[PDB]
Design a protein around this ligand. Structure first.
Ligand SMILES: CCCCCCCCCCCCCCCCCC(=O)OC[C@H](COP(=O)(O)OC[C@H](N)C(=O)O)OC(=O)CCCCCCCCCCCCCCCCC
Ligand SMILES: CCCCCCCCCCCCCCCCCC(=O)OC[C@H](COP(=O)(O)OC[C@H](N)C(=O)O)OC(=O)CCCCCCCCCCCCCCCCC
Ligand SMILES: CCCCCCCCCCCCCCCCCCCC(=O)O[C@H](COC(=O)CCCCCCCCCCCCCC)COP(=O)(O)OCCN
Ligand SMILES: *[C@@H]1O[C@H](CO)[C@@H](O[C@@H]2O[C@H](CO)[C@@H](O)[C@H](O)[C@H]2NC(C)=O)[C@H](O)[C@H]1NC(C)=O
Lengths: 56, 50
């Protein structure tokens, strides 16, 4: 429960693992979501048409 | 011939999500991927704090 006590307690190499993995897990999860949604709209299919993609 | 989640065969024309997105023989696979990449990246910080 006292997570933010533990995060300060941990050593610097472990703290950098948590640092790096927090950011990268967030980046990759939201990248998955962006991939899926821009695929549902069809913007991933090459040369689909003049339909304006929801993310260029 | 770059990598591809679906199959690039048929001159890379299998991504057309028409006839309903859920009827895309490849997109349903992507939906099944989502829960796994959600649990991994909501638990990794907790497992690492452990
Ligand atoms: C008598 C009255 C009692 C109270 C009644 C309240 C009634 C409320 C009704 C229900 C609403 C509750 C909603 C909670 C649902 C989620 C709970 C959750 O995740 O936290 C659960 C735990 C601890 O919290 P708790 O035990 O619930 O505390 C509340 C209570 N009062 C208590 O102290 O007992 O939390 C933790 O243990 C969190 C750990 C933090 C670690 C940091 C990383 C977070 C991981 C997720 C993100 C990772 C990073 C990646 C980013 C991805 C982006 C999606
Ligand atoms: C054999 C298994 C045993 C298991 C037991 C526990 C495991 C512990 C591992 C110990 C050895 C680790 C070697 C790491 C080499 C680099 C260390 C490093 O850069 O830190 C340099 C310093 C801190 O010094 P420290 O020796 O780490 O001190 C920790 C001490 N124990 C403490 O608690 O104080 O750091 C600082 O004082 C912070 C300065 C940061 C400035 C620049 C940032 C650099 C890193 C940025 C993040 C890069 C991430 C890249 C990820 C890429 C992914 C693709
Ligand atoms: C925030 C987290 C990221 C967002 C989550 C993914 C968003 C996209 C989900 C799309 C999806 O589930 O498919 C819909 C059907 O789902 C549904 O009808 C819902 C039930 C199935 C999923 C649970 C499409 O809807 P459709 O079949 O009408 O699409 C075809 C006509 N455009
Ligand atoms: C492959 O994509 C094409 C166009 O989206 C469709 O069918 C192709 O076109 C020719 C000409 O009509 C057909 O004879 C073939 O069946 C397909 N070409 C090749 C090289 O297979 C159809 O949407 C897709 N067909 C298949 C079998 O995947």
């Amino acid at each position: 429960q006292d997570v933010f006590t533990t995060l300060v307690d941990l050593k610097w190499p472990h703290t950098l693992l948590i640092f790096t993995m927090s950011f990268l897990c967030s980046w990759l999860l939201f990248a998955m979501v962006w991939w899926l949604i821009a695929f549902a709209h069809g913007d991933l299919a090459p040369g689909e048409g003049t339909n304006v993609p929801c993310v260029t | 011939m770059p990598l591809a989640f679906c199959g690039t065969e048929n001159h890379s024309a299998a991504y057309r999500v028409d006839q309903g997105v859920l009827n895309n023989g490849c997109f349903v696979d992507a939906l099944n991927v989502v829960p796994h990449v959600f649990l991994l990246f909501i638990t990794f910080p907790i497992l690492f704090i452990g």
